[PDB]
């Protein structure tokens, strides 16, 4: 038996796509964890921000990305693959807005990313893009906060709360154990950052984490400035 | 059509009529000829509604493409919009018969770029286009002031587009105004009842 | 180069990539089908990866057109590719012919696409087996399409995890003269046998083609009613 | 295993070297250039007496003035001959002049490395001896599967190429006559083959400066050369 | 060894072993020397002699009126690269009406070879070039490598026996800048020990690139 | 060859110290005086300026192409600019390729520069790609309303060539409907490109 | 790089395309399909691959009508068999469109076999692991039966068998096949061969029959018709 | 990698892209090039270990023009270095063609990381054995793209041999608090201190994009800094 | 599209894929082509056909054109593709040139198809040797070219391809005559195949093209008469 199953995205004798799972491992090689919590009133994604040098410009070390003005994408994984998926998601959103005339929903963008990961996991000549993508944002047609997570396999699912990265398992456990229908965007952000801080085991400072708290007042995607993140972290430390 | 984009000190005032003309018929008398490319990028459209709407659609597409690989989404966006409209008018010069005044606000401040039907993109502080703009040229020349604020430029633009409306059959209806400053764009509609003057200024 | 078939015959005259894709199907979540006298049912275990998952955002039981619905066992992402392809094919069929693609034609299109990916180069087979239910002139019809593009009709079936025991259970418990209600109950029972732990309405998806000839996905409330009835 | 485009650690193109071996397995061909022209003498390997020798051709008239003689894979040499004929007629059409012998040789050699993978699948398994008359000057080149054409005054390609070179090293002179060139080519061919040289198993040709033409010898001319041979 | 199958495969030590094999192909070519002065550049090459009755196969080629390349390695690869160089020269003259610079031709050759190594199925050029050109940027000598990189040299020696020629060039390196055209030809001939097998193409800021062989080279053989 | 937004006449003429180009700063939409203070000349290199008469959209297309090509060659040549001869050769080739693709640039393009050898280079490519190098070139009514004012002083003192160009542009302002505004003058000299203050060249209106 | 390329369109030392040989093996492990050419028509009879009490015999798995005059039986991969059946139907309809005549059986066979052979010789893609018993009628050769294999090699057979136990079916056909059979006699022979080399439900049948006035008609027997035919045996 | 290091698009069981990090090793082997964002500009120094003394002193650039305002220092496989330089020039030219403006170093970095990523994402390509440091003073940007395509903006970037020691030294200097002219002695000090004695003749190709150059990529004049060393 | 170098030189200078295609030819059935001044006879051994196999319209013999007969040995589908290309080429030659394609030209074309398959990336060689025979004109001598999987083609007085090619060729050499009549050529081919056929009447088929005629299958009665006359 040839070894194509372990080097290319073809099924092994166990019917597993080894390269897809290795792209999951490559996602975990990002060394960062992202926790996204989507409440009725807000969606907060907090991804711990690790800069390896003091000589790297921190503003360039990001996992939050503007896909559209509305849709944000917290991409965890290989930085080259993260950049590729950022530009691919932006191209998907642009093509969708051009063909359909309106900004891409988070759900459709998640499905398009899932299709890209399916063509990577089916086309043997295309690598699975080692990116776990937490797409999020206020869908206007439903006026509700969409939060989809697309795996490197392309497994896309909407989430009330999701996690990605190294502590994805622990973060998911904490989310599904302590999740609530938070009444305020501040509550959603506090829970997101508290879950991320707990699973990471390190008390965070605003510089150490990127937070995007999309609310109905501010539905446009944007990384929260370090002052708002610091206020959220203080609220977390308040309890 | 009448289009009049004024780059003021504190913003851009893009005025237009609302009359789409199909011969002597007005298929759309409440036409919004100033298309919102982005919250602070607007395209006042003159010429074939299909062609100019395709230009607005394609410049939105090209501005999103410009933002695929960058995070400074607010940089050179008016200038890139004008360059893209110019490139599309030149590329589809045979097909497209469209002139776009792309005005608005970006990181570089308030900017108006008139891309003529020829595909000639020029940065202007006072750009006018359309069959109606002709009738107001002297008016603009004698009533435009480089120091006009966005309020003063808005009043002047309403008056000029009203004159073009009155004198131009192809221009008519309401004056669609877009005031784009750093804070965003405000749309106003000056219906014929609210316009400074009407047909009665003709010979009187 | 890319365009060389990675699905090739082995010494024994077996396409080993086909068997690998069938294995991927056999680890892809239990899905059941049951042909009633007056309809057909495609149920499936839809145990989300986490409770935080939103069920409606990724449903295994899907509608291909008004009359044809589809569930799958295997890789969810290339099932979504197959499903987009089938919906597009049925829309093209409606455009060309003014009617929804027939159940057997939807099945043949799915089989053709899977076979294509079994033969063209640079690709693996689809790691999904589809249970497609839809009506035809002679009655309801459940169909299985394999990663190989080999399709065949069924009276009852299971495809995913523990599908051999589920198929034996259907052999024992399936009857020809079942109603759509009884087919739904049989599908739920087969899922229960193929599933460990409490089998609730939120953990399964049911699609049904009933006397009306139209495919509908039962909501969680209908599934709860069936569980409690 | 490895691609046809693989370079060996020594730096040799493995497929090119293997094509050169295939050439070494081909029928012997000797080109002798004299100031009065140039002579091809190639072994025709008549495997059977029912094989029509006239159809087994190593010598091909590329144009009126230039011709080639092959060693190795006859079909690959046929493709090279087709290219050379198309290029000689294209040069005649484009410039109203006979193609230069160097020009046509280089043209065929530019096709030698055109093989690849991931165009031809492999190098040409045939080496050529291209002899012709350019501006009244007799030119002779030898091309190997590597696409390396080198102008020659006396060369041999095929089974006994090394032996033919050894023989010519002390038999070929730069001031021979056309008759002497014919004798040397035929003798070198006879000494570097495993059969007897008669008018049927040998194909002779001359790019002659006097006529400025590449003419493949008829049976009578080959018989004459065979008869004149001292041994 | 197992990483030495494609020009697309890096080795664990970050090397493209097939590129290095094409480089070894170049290193096994005939000696080729290039010299650069303030006003003239020279490439002298010992043309290969496959047989005693074979005229030495030319290696010093004429690319542009003021650019000439000495190809060392696979002659057919060198000829394909020279056709590509003629295309680049033709397109530069078409676009701008001026002769392309040998630096630009070296860049194009480097890009072509790098493409040959950056995609599977295509193979690195077994040939390495010594391109001398005297243009507006002056006289410039470039050693273009199969890997897809070129080095601008005041002088260089490639192929077999290249070490002794390189050492000789290093000895007289600081002399070359002001050396006269005849002096530069003489330096090239000294650095390149085999006479008839030696071609020598010389270009200057004023004089075009011209190839001298045997008799034409006798005045400088010394 | 459609000219909707037209740049008007250009009059370039060599004088002792360089090339003096002149043109109004007006773009005309048909007969309309549409835009003002639009230099018909674009400095593409420190010693190469390019003007055009005719479709100014096509001039902008050409200037974008020229600037892209100059930037490409600057990248190749460590920031070194193409010579005026090279830039004009590329413009000739581009405009002839556009006329052969049947999408001609409806602009007569003047390339005025100083070559690195210090030689004044004044050339012109017509919309059809026909190009020529002259010591003085008129485009538009700068060619027609020209007489001998430039030919008699071309390569003369800056004052004489300026006076002749001023005569030609007085003729243009008098007799060209599309002539609007002050005539900007530009000296392309070995010391760079200097935009002299635009002058209102007045026709003699005592004629009335 | 072709590291995992199987060289499908590559000869083996024996001169055999290994992929084609393995496709032939795949066929030989598939349900038996027997063709018997009688006086006016051909009886094709295949073993369904997917059978069982829970399987619904709604469609012929192996029997595929190519055109009013051509029917096929499948041995091997029913998927690529369906692909080649679609291509055969399209080719027969293209011939009808071009000539307003029903495609001669040998031409349709040649077309499907050229498809198979193109996969065996070019493209590096796996061959069609299907063997067709193409029964058909044309005015030239009357009623014909063609056995086609993955190599693209086809031959006309008065009777033949492919699939599992194809040699036993071939031997039975040799023993009992006679020329100038009737439709009933050939159907009986096919049923006898299938039963001796192997249930009505599992078996499927298709009779091509040429009547002088009605033309050539293909009739793929349904479950009830095959059950009646089996009970007659 | 037990077979996971021959195909660039192949992940190791640990998710490693072995061909990509072999390209990174090709980068590490090359002589160090470092960019420093200074207050007056950005200074791209590139150590050039002249293997042969016959190399033209004013040649073999490690730093290239990408725009009138973008320079590109290169580290690693020189063929890949120049291929990426030409592809970055093409990306900037295409950016101007599409949008009529000059690309910014962050955006050029994204677009060129696209090609880097394609190298190890689609089959039949080879990862680019090069890191490219794009410096633009107009953009105030110093973005290094690694062979994987991972591109980051830097206050002071450095790649190649002894790049870790070079980064440590670059940390000791607040480049944005000093000008490029007074940063040149510090950068030259760092390179000389980390320079390997194996090479007796070597150079420091120093470009700067500064107010003095109006943001233009200019090789530092020899009067300001003598790159030649023996 | 797939472009792997299926046919590549081995270290010894052989194209192993061509050797395997020759093996496929050998596993193919035996064909013998013989020529009389005004006739060409191709006798092919029918494969062992059971009572259940239709023996009509499945002969290895084919007419590439009204003047060109073809027979093959090797993979039947490869030969079918070659014959389709050859017939298309004969009609294409008639279209481009009013003249019928010369037997040399069509044999060259088929052998060049085989050569292209040995040169085309991703194309398997034709596992088929083709005896392509015919008359160029009314006055032209009959031609019998043999084209091999390697793409080489050679004209033969009489040739055999397929299994038993050694034995049938030996018989041809022992029994060939320079000026055989139509009957003598028919007898030569029939006996050459008779030596290696279990049955004479059954396993053997014959097709003859006389001068100024098309492909013509032998009558079973006349074929039996010739077989019995030979024995």
Residue numbers in the entry:
A (entry chain A): 2 to 240
B (entry chain H): 1 to 204
C (entry chain B): 3 to 231
D (entry chain E): 9 to 126, 134 to 246
E (entry chain F): 4 to 197, 206 to 233
F (entry chain N): 1 to 208
G (entry chain C): 2 to 199, 205 to 239
H (entry chain G): 5 to 234
Q: Paper's wording?
A:
We address this challenge by creating a recombinant protozoan proteasome by expressing all seven α and seven β subunits of Tv20S alongside the Ump-1 chaperone in insect cells.
By comparison, CP-17 bound to four of six catalytic subunits, corresponding to β2 and β5 from each β-ring. For CP-17, the α,β-epoxyketone group is covalently bound to Thr-1 forming a morpholino derivative. Beyond the S1 pocket, the P2 tryptophan of CP-17 interacts with the β2 active site through its indole ring that resides on the hydrophilic ridge of the shallow S2 pocket, whereas the indole ring of the P3 tryptophan is buried and fits well within the deep S3 pocket. In contrast, the density of CP-17 in the β5 site was clearly defined. The α,β-epoxyketone group was covalently bound to Thr-1 and the P1 phenylalanine is located in the S1 pocket, which is lined with Lys33, Ala46, and Ala69. The P3 indole is anchored in the relatively deep S3 pocket, defined by π–π interaction with the residue Phe27. Finally, the hexyl group of CP-17 sits in a well-defined shallow pocket formed by the hydrophobic parts of four residues belonging to the neighboring β6 chain (Tyr116, Asp136, Pro137, and Val138). For instance, the arrangement of the S2 substrate binding pocket in the β1 subunit prevents interactions with CP-17. Despite this relatively high sequence identity, the fine structural variances within the active site pockets present opportunities for designing selective inhibitors targeting Tv20S over human 20S, as illustrated by CP-17, which inhibits the Tv20S β5 subunit with a 10-fold higher potency than the equivalent subunit of the human constitutive proteasome.
